[PDB]
Amino acid sequence: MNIFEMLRIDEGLRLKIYKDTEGYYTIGIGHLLTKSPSLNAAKSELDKAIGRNTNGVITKDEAEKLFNQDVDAAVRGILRNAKLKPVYDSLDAVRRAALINMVFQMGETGVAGFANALRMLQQKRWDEAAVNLAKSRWYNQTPNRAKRVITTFRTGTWDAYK
Ligand SMILES: [Cl-]
Ligand SMILES: [Cl-]
């Protein structure tokens, strides 16, 4: 298992514009297009991302291409973030994947907001961090996905995904 497979499990794949769990326009493998309520605006962002007139529908290869960019950007975003980098550097391979997942989903700013859990992860206090992570809107809104990510941090294994 790896980050790509993990996120493909958490986000799914949709080839037509859809609304995410928050009601935002998305496409592919969790690629947010816009927070604006307007479908046109969504379509416009889509065309600009793909580089052709898509009419709201993309192919599988296009979806995977956005996906590669988004994962790459997430990693690079962690590495540039003063608060995140040190956490990431401190972790093992499995748990690094858990942190990338969260950043892909909520953005770096959002993750950097879990200050306490981050310190706990850096200190390798697994159980405590897991409890702290669960007390968040994130967990209350997407509990099953959150639970998977949190077990991964707790255990350092991919069991939640097998
Ligand atoms: Cl883009
Ligand atoms: Cl969920």
Note down, in words, how this protein is organized.
It is a single chain. The protein is mainly alpha-helical. It has one domain (1-162): Lysozyme, CATH 1.10.530.40. The chain is built from 9 helices and 3 strands, in the order H-E-E-E-H-H-H-H-H-H-H-H. It has helices spanning 3-11, 39-50, 60-80, 85-90, 93-112, 115-122, 126-134, 137-141, 143-155, and strands at residues 14-19, 25-28, 31-34. It has a 3-stranded antiparallel sheet with strand order 1-2-3. Strand 1 and strand 2 (25-28) form a beta hairpin. Helix 3 (60-80) crosses helix 5 (93-112) and helix 7 runs antiparallel to helix 9 (143-155). The chain is elongated. The N and C termini lie close together (9 Å). It binds chloride ion (CL) (2 copies). It is found in: Host cytoplasm. Substrate binds at residues 32, 104, 117, 132. Its EC number is 3.2.1.17. The active site is at residues 11, 20. It catalyses: Hydrolysis of (1->4)-beta-linkages between N-acetylmuramic acid and N-acetyl-D-glucosamine residues in a peptidoglycan and between N-acetyl-D-glucosamine residues in chitodextrins.
